[PDB]
Every structure is written in structure tokens, then in C-alpha cells.
């Protein structure tokens, strides 16, 4: 007496552990098995899954003690999938150096330190009260606890298995309890009838991997799947032709871009990087391939940033006259510059590159594509230009301009970006700053330095497309996850 939900997915996460499973394919499963202290209410106040409002979920209420500490009064009676009651010890363990940010913890959870602020050891007050605190001032703690970092894990169960074994048999407080897993095949979650919130609407949720988009579409038409993920606006023509099925698309909080290996002699200066950025006609590419459904942000600036969003920012410059001048100043000899890309990873990555190549040709730059595979990934020295994506996972400007382009991060340390000292000093300031006039003005200067230096060139915010049966009532959210809490009704 409850319909079974079948989901055709592009793949499965490397793990089901909340932090280790963070990927394009991860959150859509992990969000059902786990809950966080704070939940993002995507559909609050009639929004289309884009609202950044943070409502209290595992924590009944929260009071900020100071610039680095928050007291969490927890919900009582919340039970994990194994029956154990969720206490402050479980919440403290979730954000402790033993599990998340310690030197030994990062061996099993590599990105535990990366996806976290400067954590300090949490303090358990009573059975349902814990104080989550950081070593340095941070006004983003609540935003970090409401992101994919948030999910609370059980202390006695996780410790007895480890981050590796827990990823194959996870236990959480979400509305769907993990049942079975077949590597690179499927994940099945049965309905958690002991859920503290609204009773689950589906009996079982299966994540069947259907690697090819055509096979995924055929499966939805045949009746094998209720919802299919990872489709492009071009695939709408076939699915929308069937009256029983429909496409439901959304502008996801991800950023398609192309970065450079600034260790190469040609890309250590900002001159040729700026020439390549100024020659790209972004509206033309979005119009031709995305059917004008993708968005072009005004710099590293997105509406989901909240107070750190400047709606009055100028759009990224398109100047062929200036791009041509920069090529003359750079002393570019005409040697073909490689562009490493996968033929089936980023949506429209190959057709967009073909268009950009003609735009770079107009500026005087010979750019040739180099198709690679996961098992044929090139070494850093073989890379000149490469396509890349950045999931803007925080409901704040910190990710990913500070997150990936800041001091000590990959773009500067691994890809040799000699960033200005002003950029790195402002990156440290915005981390500890409080949302205001000064913090918003610091992000504007960071964006201006980012466009001037051009360590990466932002192409567009992609439009992710899903396809579902009309009898399954589910609206997609603006993130690389699926929300079924009060957003899954069978007819």
C-alpha cells in the first residue's frame, strides 16, 4: 500500500558515508538516509527549489553564543535506523577530530577538513544539548551545518565499523533506511516507519545505474523507472512527446568553467589567460546548446549566496578587440594549445568547445581539443587548458572562490597560480567576517581580482534536466541532490 520509487541514475557514489560520498551521484541517496541539525527549505514561501532558508531539522532550536560558538537544543525521541536514540554525543562525534577534522580522521575521510570551517572540539552539555564551536571566528557555521557536511552519524555504530565499512552499510536518522547495495549497479532504501518527521510516501527507493542517457530515456518510456536523472535540454524533445511522462528541469548551483595549468610558460602570466576569457561569446553558446536555459552569472556571483550576492554587478566582458591585443602582448607563437575534456562527462562540453575554438581562432589563438577518459587522465605537465566544474555547495560566497581558489588550495598550490597578495588576504578576511557592508565589498574586490587575473574562466551555470512520470509528483531542487520530504506524492 505504497508505490515503489524507481530511479534511473547516471552512476553511484564511491561511498554512502556522508562526507566520502560527496559527488554528483552522492547527495540524492545520502539525503534520504541521513538528517542534519539544520535543513535547507528549498520550497519555502513558494520558491522553485532555490530558497536558501535554513529551518531547524535535528536541532529543535539554536542560539549563537559568540562569533565562534553555537548551542544546539536537540530534538528528543529521534531514533537512528538501528533503533539507538540520537543524543548530543552522536552530534559531537559527527563534528569531532576523531571522525571529521583530525589528523587520523582525514586518513579515512580525506575531504573532512576541506568541507569544514576551522572546527574546534564540540562540547556536550546534556543528553540533548551540544555546543558546536570553531577555533577562529566564523559566521558561516550554520551554513556549513545545513550543507552536505551536516548529516549526523551514530557514535557507537560508526566507530565499530569505520568510515570505509560504514559507507557500505550506513545507519542514519533519515526517512529511508539503507537495505542493500550492489557496486556500480543499484542502491535500495526501504521506508523508515520510525521517522520523526512526515511519514515516508514511498515503500522502497531504488537507484538503478543506467550509464547511457538514451537507455535511461528508453527505460522511463518502457515503465522501468519513475524518475530518470542527468539529462540535457536537447533530450526534452523525446520525453515531452509522451503524454504520460514529462521533463522537470532546474538551474543547478554548479559552475561550468575552464581552468589553466599556470605552471606552463604560456599560462604563468595573466595576459593569455585574459585573452582566452575575453574571446568567449557566452550568450551565443548558451543560446545554441542550452536553448537559453543555462544562466550566465555576473562574475563569481550567484543568487544563492544570500547577503554575498551583488545583483548590480556587471556581466563578464566579451571584447574581441581586447582579446586580440592581449595575444599580441603575450607573444603567442601559434603553437596549438591543448584543451583536455571528456566526451561524455560535462553536459554539452564537446559542442561548446567546438564553438569556443572558432572564437579563440578569431582572437588569433590555435586551440585544439584533446579527448581523455578516466583511465587515460593526463599528467599535470601534459595539461594546458582543461574543463572543470565547481559545485557551489555553501549558501554563501565562500564556495568556491575561496573554497578552491584561496591560499593553500589546489589552484595555487597544485596548478601554480601566483595570486596577488591582496586576493589571499581578502580570502582570509571573508572567512572570519560577519555579513555586512565590509564583507559584501570584500567579495566584490575578490571577483574583480578573479576577472583581472583569470585563473579560471567561468562559462555558465548549467541547467540540469530530469524526466519523470506525471503520476509521480516530485519537483527538483536547485542542487545536485533529490528532496522527497514533503515533495513526493504518488497518484
Amino acid at each position: 500500500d505504497r508505490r515503489a520509487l524507481r530511479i534511473g541514475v547516471n552512476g553511484l557514489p564511491p561511498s554512502l558515508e556522508p562526507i566520502n560520498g560527496i559527488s554528483n551521484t552522492g547527495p540524492r541517496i545520502i539525503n534520504q538516509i541521513f538528517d542534519a541539525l539544520i535543513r535547507r527549505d528549498y520550497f519555502a514561501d513558494g520558491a522553485k527549489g532555490n530558497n536558501i532558508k535554513l529551518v531547524p531539522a535535528l536541532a529543535e532550536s539554536f542560539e549563537r553564543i559568540d562569533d565562534k560558538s553555537i548551542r544546539f537544543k536537540l530534538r528528543q525521541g529521534v531514533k537512528f535506523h538501528n533503533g539507538a536514540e540520537m543524543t548530543a554525543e552522536d552530534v559531537a562525534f559527527t563534528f569531532s577530530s576523531e571522525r571529521l577534522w583530525g589528523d587520523e580522521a582525514i586518513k579515512t575521510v580525506p575531504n573532512g577538513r576541506n568541507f569544514s570551517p576551522n572546527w574546534d572540539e564540540p562540547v556536550v552539555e546534556d543528553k540533548y544539548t551540544v555546543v558546536l564551536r570553531t577555533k577562529t571566528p566564523s559566521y558561516l557555521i550554520e551554513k556549513y551545518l545545513g550543507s552536505w557536511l551536516g548529516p549526523i552519524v551514530p557514535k557507537e555504530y560508526y566507530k565499530s565499523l569505520g568510515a570505509v565499512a560504514f559507507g557500505n552499510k550506513p545507519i542514519g536518522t533519515g526517512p529511508y533506511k539503507f537495505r542493500e547495495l550492489v557496486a556500480n549497479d543499484h542502491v535500495t532504501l526501504e521506508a523508515n516507519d520510525g521517522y520523526w518527521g512526515d511519514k515516508p510516501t514511498a515503500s522502497t527507493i531504488t537507484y538503478q545505474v543506467v550509464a547511457e542517457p538514451a537507455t535511461r530515456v528508453a527505460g522511463l518510456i518502457s515503465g522501468e523507472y519513475d524518475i530518470i536523472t542527468t539529462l540535457t535540454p536537447d533530450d526534452m524533445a523525446l520525453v515531452d512527446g509522451y503524454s504520460d511522462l514529462e521533463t522537470r528541469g532546474t538551474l543547478i548551483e554548479n559552475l561550468h568553467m575552464f581552468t589553466f595549468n599556470m605552471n606552463q610558460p604560456i599560462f604563468q602570466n595573466k595576459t593569455l589567460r585574459r585573452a582566452l576569457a575575453l574571446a568567449v561569446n557566452r550568450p551565443l553558446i548558451v543560446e545554441a546548446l542550452w536553448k537559453n536555459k543555462a544562466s550566465i552569472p555576473n562574475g563569481f556571483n550567484f543568487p544563492h549566496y544570500g547577503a554575498t550576492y551583488d545583483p548590480k554587478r556587471k556581466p563578464m566582458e566579451f571584447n574581441l578587440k581586447e582579446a586580440k591585443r592581449l595575444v599580441k602582448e603575450s607573444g603567442y607563437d601559434g603553437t596549438p594549445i591543448t584543451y583536455h575534456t571528456m566526451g561524455n562527462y560535462y553536459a554539452n562540453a564537446v559542442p561548446a568547445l567546438m564553438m569556443m575554438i572558432e572564437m579563440w581562432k578569431a582572437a588569433g589563438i590555435t586551440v585544439v581539443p584533446k579527448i581523455f577518459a578516466p583511465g587515460t587522465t593526463p599528467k599535470d605537465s601534459d595539461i594546458l587548458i582543461r574543463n572543470w566544474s565547481n559545485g557551489q555547495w555553501l549558501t554563501d560566497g565562500l564556495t568556491t572562490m575561496v573554497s578552491e581558489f584561496g591560499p593553500g588550495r589546489g589552484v595555487q598550490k597544485r596548478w601554480g597560480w601566483k595570486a596577488p597578495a591582496e586576493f589571499n588576504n581578502l580570502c582570509d578576511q571573508v572567512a572570519q567576517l560577519k555579513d555586512g557592508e565590509e564583507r559584501s565589498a570584500a567579495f566584490n574586490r575578490l571577483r574583480d581580482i578573479f576577472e583581472d587575473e583569470a585563473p579560471a574562466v567561468l562559462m555558465y551555470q548549467p541547467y540540469d534536466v530530469y524526466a519523470a512520470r506525471k503520476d509521480v509528483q516530485w519537483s527538483p531542487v536547485s542542487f545536485e541532490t533529490m528532496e522527497f520530504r514533503g515533495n513526493l506524492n504518488f497518484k
Side-chain angles (χ1 to χ4, degrees):
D1 290 346
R2 243 191 298 193
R3 277 186 63 200
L5 182 62
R6 292 148 294 159
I7 307 170
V9 297
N10 59 309
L12 287 182
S15 172
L16 283 172
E17 199 271 340
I19 311 301
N20 287 342
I22 290 169
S23 55
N24 168 255
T25 59
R28 74 171 65 107
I29 312 171
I30 298 160
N31 192 26
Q32 331 301 334
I33 308 168
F34 302 90
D35 276 330
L37 300 169
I38 306 173
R39 191 177 57 84
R40 181 173 160 189
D41 210 337
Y42 305 98
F43 301 97
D45 316 292
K48 307 301 179 176
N50 47 40
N51 200 349
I52 65 169
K53 177 183 197 164
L54 286 174
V55 292
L58 285 185
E60 248 163 30
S61 64
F62 48 89
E63 261 199 36
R64 200 175 245 275
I65 301 168
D66 65 355
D67 58 348
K68 56 187 72 68
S69 309
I70 307 169
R71 179 175 276 104
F72 286 95
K73 300 184 78 171
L74 309 174
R75 274 197 195 271
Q76 309 181 41
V78 172
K79 300 284 196 166
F80 276 99
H81 297 143
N82 63 349
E85 199 193 5
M86 192 262 304
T87 71
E89 282 270 12
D90 300 307
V91 181
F93 174 67
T94 305
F95 307 107
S96 66
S97 59
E98 189 171 30
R99 180 252 172 188
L100 190 62
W101 51 277
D103 284 336
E104 193 65 35
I106 57 151
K107 298 185 185 178
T108 52
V109 185
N111 289 342
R113 209 121 81 183
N114 290 248
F115 289 130
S116 289
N118 191 19
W119 289 124
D120 201 349
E121 182 72 22
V123 184
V124 171
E125 309 216 318
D126 59 62
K127 195 185 182 178
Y128 310 104
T129 302
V130 63
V131 171
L132 301 186
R133 50 164 183 149
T134 68
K135 301 165 170 164
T136 53
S138 174
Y139 292 84
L140 310 177
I141 310 174
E142 307 97 329
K143 303 207 166 176
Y144 268 107
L145 300 164
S147 75
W148 50 31
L149 176 73
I152 301 298
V153 294
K155 183 193 167 200
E156 304 292 324
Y157 178 77
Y158 191 110
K159 275 193 65 58
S160 63
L161 266 69
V164 185
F166 184 93
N168 298 327
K169 202 144 191 161
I171 289 301
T173 53
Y176 293 95
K177 39 196 175 196
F178 171 82
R179 175 197 272 190
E180 61 190 14
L181 161 67
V182 184
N184 285 33
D185 181 35
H186 79 93
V187 169
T188 308
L189 320 171
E190 67 170 30
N192 173 29
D193 296 320
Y195 186 54
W196 59 271
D198 313 321
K199 181 188 177 174
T201 54
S203 57
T204 48
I205 297 181
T206 312
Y207 296 91
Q208 184 64 52
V209 180
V210 203
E212 292 80 44
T215 323
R216 224 141 53 224
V217 168
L220 174 84
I221 298 166
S222 75
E224 251 292 321
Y225 310 101
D226 289 301
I227 312 167
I228 54 167
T229 75
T230 324
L231 300 172
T232 71
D234 293 25
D235 307 331
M236 283 185 168
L238 181 59
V239 176
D240 288 319
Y242 289 87
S243 46
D244 320 330
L245 320 159
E246 73 176 32
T247 73
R248 295 157 190 184
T250 181
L251 210 42
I252 59 165
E253 284 155 15
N254 193 274
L255 185 51
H256 276 204
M257 65 181 67
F258 62 93
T259 185
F260 313 94
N261 176 20
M262 295 149 284
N263 285 309
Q264 296 295 158
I266 206 175
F267 291 139
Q268 24 208 39
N269 309 290
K270 74 186 196 193
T271 169
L272 202 71
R273 311 201 301 257
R274 268 272 288 185
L276 290 157
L278 282 164
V280 174
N281 191 6
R282 297 169 191 89
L284 188 64
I285 307 167
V286 167
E287 171 212 314
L289 311 171
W290 297 84
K291 310 183 177 205
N292 277 126
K293 282 171 164 62
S295 195
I296 311 168
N298 303 336
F300 228 128
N301 178 58
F302 290 89
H304 82 279
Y305 285 177
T308 49
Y309 164 59
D310 189 357
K312 302 166 182 178
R313 258 195 77 90
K314 309 295 173 176
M316 298 170 300
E317 197 178 344
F318 169 52
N319 206 333
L320 191 57
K321 205 175 181 187
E322 194 64 30
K324 280 174 172 181
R325 185 205 74 85
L326 284 159
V327 185
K328 268 199 182 178
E329 199 197 355
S330 72
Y332 173 65
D333 47 12
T335 299
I337 305 172
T338 65
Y339 187 110
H340 293 269
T341 179
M342 287 181 269
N344 50 13
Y345 190 52
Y346 298 120
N348 285 329
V350 185
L353 173 58
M354 296 182 177
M355 287 188 63
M356 285 192 300
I357 280 167
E358 81 186 324
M359 299 170 184
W360 292 320
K361 175 179 278 191
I365 313 168
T366 299
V367 171
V368 304
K370 204 70 176 173
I371 269 68
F372 79 103
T376 320
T377 304
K379 182 237 168 76
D380 298 11
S381 81
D382 299 304
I383 300 166
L384 264 300
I385 316 174
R386 56 144 200 169
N387 59 176
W388 195 38
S389 84
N390 270 348
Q392 317 287 303
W393 51 282
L394 265 184
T395 50
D396 181 78
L398 209 88
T399 67
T400 63
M401 182 152 58
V402 179
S403 168
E404 300 276 68
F405 298 88
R409 283 90 161 184
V411 174
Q412 302 197 26
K413 222 171 94 47
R414 188 182 183 194
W415 303 105
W417 178 37
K418 275 293 185 173
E422 184 178 16
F423 189 89
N424 295 357
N425 186 254
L426 286 164
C427 284
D428 302 330
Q429 276 175 275
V430 298
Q432 311 176 118
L433 241 52
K434 189 178 190 177
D435 263 331
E437 316 162 55
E438 184 182 357
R439 195 168 181 255
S440 276
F443 270 109
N444 276 333
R445 183 59 176 147
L446 276 177
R447 289 159 197 158
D448 287 354
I449 298 171
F450 181 82
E451 293 181 31
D452 189 20
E453 287 285 312
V457 182
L458 317 180
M459 297 152 62
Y460 47 73
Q461 169 181 15
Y463 184 81
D464 200 4
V465 187
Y466 293 92
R469 304 196 66 175
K470 289 187 182 173
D471 48 44
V472 183
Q473 191 188 108
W474 168 80
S475 293
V477 307
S478 66
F479 202 64
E480 293 163 77
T481 177
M482 295 172 75
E483 181 73 273
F484 301 130
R485 291 173 186 87
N487 188 35
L488 182 64
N489 307 293
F490 299 103
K491 308 194 304 157

